């Protein structure tokens, strides 16, 4: 099965990377063990949604395309390697983002930089190595492949879009007109930049390119199937599903209990431009807006409890139901448009949506 092939390829890639460090980079066994532990701790334990989307898209095409058995095996192995490039790209951004944000946990486990024998000094570089490994595995496994050029170019643009999104996110509680490397940034007092368009831009770049666009397009590239789709349509459906995914994460940060969330949610304390804050500001009256400004972006638990009460009272659940209903209409419309050129790819998008929704 797909998951078992995917996990087996992780062991193969790891062995290759570590053997190459020994044969070419003069690594010693203790540092190779540190790196093996770092790779397992940062890359494993999740759902592998991104990596498995590449494999699922590739298997959809295998069902409808004539190939020798050895070719089907090669395509699946390429989809697994490609899927691991995305999982390692994610691992790079989670390691770095956890250090940037001073995060404590991620999925009921301490953040990598918090491990006693790691520290921020190592962890920042470990994050750098994680991304460097994505390129090492591409050049090694896809050296003779016709899709190598397109895959490297796509991967670079998605990585860049992600870093641009991280910039939009970390600066989301500042006033744009006040941004200045020379002056410490005050948190906004007016919240004028907490709008649906500004929120959409953070989410589009920070998450949707690496979580949805990259796995779908990589599945097409390893299958040599990019002519079966209109790329503008794949972009629109990736950004749409990706946004819905983040709206879910945002609601969960505030209302999902820490035991289920796998961390203590701090979007309110961090003054993040969340779906809840933007949607609340789109419907609140004068007194509610004023109460929001006097309590948002503060570590004080009483102030955090005021914000959480305003959200519950504002009936944000109704806004979510309306938003979700709108997303369902649009996702179905885009799936219908994809069916024109590829029913197989349209079906893979339907699975990705079902897994998100």
Ligand X SMILES: O=C(O)Cc1csc2ccc(Cl)cc12
Under rule CB under 6 A, how many of the chain's residues touch ligand X?
15
Regarding 125 and contact with a second copy (CB under 8 A), the answer is: yes
Q: To the nearest 5 percent, what fractions of the chain are helix, strand and coil?
A: 75, 0, 25
Regarding 269 and contact with Zn ion (CB under 5 A), the answer is: no
Regarding 153 and contact with ligand X (CB under 6 A), the answer is: yes
Q: Which does 16 bind (CB under 5 to 8 A by kind): Zn ion, ligand X, a second copy, none?
A: none
What span, in angstroms and rounded, lies between the C-alpha atoms of 244 and 138? 30
Regarding 144 and contact with a second copy (CB under 8 A), the answer is: no
Q: How far is the CB of 162 from ligand X (least distance, A)?
A: 9
Pick between residue 83 and residue 165 the one whose CB is nearest to a second copy. Answer: 165
What span, in angstroms and rounded, lies between the C-alpha atoms of 39 and 132? 12
What size, in residues, is the chain?
357
The binder of a second copy chosen from 16, 34, 255, 320 (CB under 8 A): 34
Burial of 308 (0-12, 13-18, 19+ CB in 10 A): middle
The binder of ligand X chosen from 101, 150, 249, 298 (CB under 6 A): 150
Q: Classify strands 109-110 and 105-106 as parallel, antiparallel or unpaired.
A: antiparallel
What span, in angstroms and rounded, lies between the C-alpha atoms of 168 and 202? 5
Place of tokens 């804050």: 277
What span, in angstroms and rounded, lies between the C-alpha atoms of 20 and 89? 20
List, comma-separated, the residues after which the chain is broken, a break being a C to N distance over 2.5 A; otherwise answer none: none
Q: Are 295 and 306 in contact (CB under 8 A)?
A: yes
Q: Are 84 and 12 in contact (CB under 8 A)?
A: no
* Displacement of CA 276 from its chain's centroid (Å): 20
Pick between residue 66 and residue 189 the one whose CB is nearest to a second copy. Answer: 189
Regarding 149 and contact with a second copy (CB under 8 A), the answer is: yes
Q: Which residues are annotated as a binding site?
A: 97, 101, 169, 235, 249, 253, 267
* Binding mask of the shown chain, residues 70 to 109, with x at each position contacting a second copy by CB under 8 A: --------------------------x--xxx--------
The DSSP secondary structure of 52-118, one letter per residue, reads HHHHHHHHHHHTTS---HHHHHHHHHHHHHHHHHHHHHHHHHHHHHHHHHT--EETTEE-GGGSTTT
Q: How far is the CB of 95 from ligand X (least distance, A)?
A: 22
Regarding 9 and contact with ligand X (CB under 6 A), the answer is: no
Structure tokens at 114: 């918090």
* Binding mask of the shown chain, residues 15 to 54, with x at each position contacting ligand X by CB under 6 A: ---------xx-----------------------------
Q: Which does 156 bind (CB under 5 to 8 A by kind): Zn ion, a second copy, ligand X, none?
A: a second copy
Q: Which does 158 bind (CB under 5 to 8 A by kind): Zn ion, a second copy, ligand X, none?
A: ligand X
Pick between residue 310 and residue 331 the one whose CB is nearest to ligand X. Answer: 331
Pick between residue 101 and residue 291 the one whose CB is nearest to Zn ion. Answer: 101
Chain residues 37-56 in contact with a second copy, contact rule CB under 8 A: 37-38, 41
Q: Are 7 and 29 in contact (CB under 8 A)?
A: no
The binder of Zn ion chosen from 18, 34, 41, 97 (CB under 5 A): 97
Pick between residue 2 and residue 41 the one whose CB is nearest to a second copy. Answer: 41
């Amino acid at each position: 099965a797909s998951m078992e092939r995917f996990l087996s390829v992780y062991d193969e890639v790891q062995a290759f990377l570590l053997d190459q460090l020994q044969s070419k980079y003069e690594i010693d066994p203790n540092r190779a063990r540190y790196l093996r532990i770092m790779m397992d701790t940062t890359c494993l334990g999740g759902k592998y949604f991104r990596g498995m989307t590449v494999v699922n898209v590739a298997e959809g095409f295998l069902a409808v395309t004539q190939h020798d058995e050895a070719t089907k095996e090669r395509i699946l192995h390429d989809a697994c390697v490609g899927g691991w490039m995305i999982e390692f790209l994610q691992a790079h951004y989670l390691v770095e983002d956890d250090i940037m944000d001073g995060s404590v946990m991620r999925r009921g486990k301490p953040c990598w930089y918090r491990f006693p024998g790691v520290t921020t000094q190592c962890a920042i570089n470990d994050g750098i190595i994680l991304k460097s490994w994505t390129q090492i595995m591409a050049w090694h496994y896809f050296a003779d492949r016709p899709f190598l050029k397109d895959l490297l170019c796509l991967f670079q643009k998605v990585d860049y879009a992600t870093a641009v999104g991280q910039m939009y996110d970390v600066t989301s509680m500042c006033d744009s007109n006040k941004l200045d490397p020379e002056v410490a940034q005050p948190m906004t007092t007016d919240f004028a930049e907490f709008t649906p368009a500004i929120y959409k831009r953070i989410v589009k770049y920070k998450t949707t390119f690496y979580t949805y666009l990259l796995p779908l397009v990589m599945g097409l590239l390893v299958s040599e199937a990019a002519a079966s789709v209109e790329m503008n349509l794949v972009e629109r459906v990736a950004h749409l599903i990706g946004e819905y995914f983040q709206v879910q994460d945002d609601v969960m940060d505030c209302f999902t209990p820490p035991e289920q969330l796998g961390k203590v949610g701090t979007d309110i304390e961090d003054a993040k431009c969340s779906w809840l804050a933007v949607t609340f500001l789109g419907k609140a009256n004068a007194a509610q807006v004023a109460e929001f400004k006097a309590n948002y972006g503060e570590k004080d638990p009483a102030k955090v409890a005021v914000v959480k009460r305003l959200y519950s009272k504002a009936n944000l659940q109704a806004d979510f139901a309306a938003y979700e209903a709108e997303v369902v209409r649009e996702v179905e419309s885009l799936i219908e448009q994809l069916k024109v050129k590829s029913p197989t790819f349209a079906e893979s998008v339907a699975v990705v949506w079902e897994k998100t929704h």
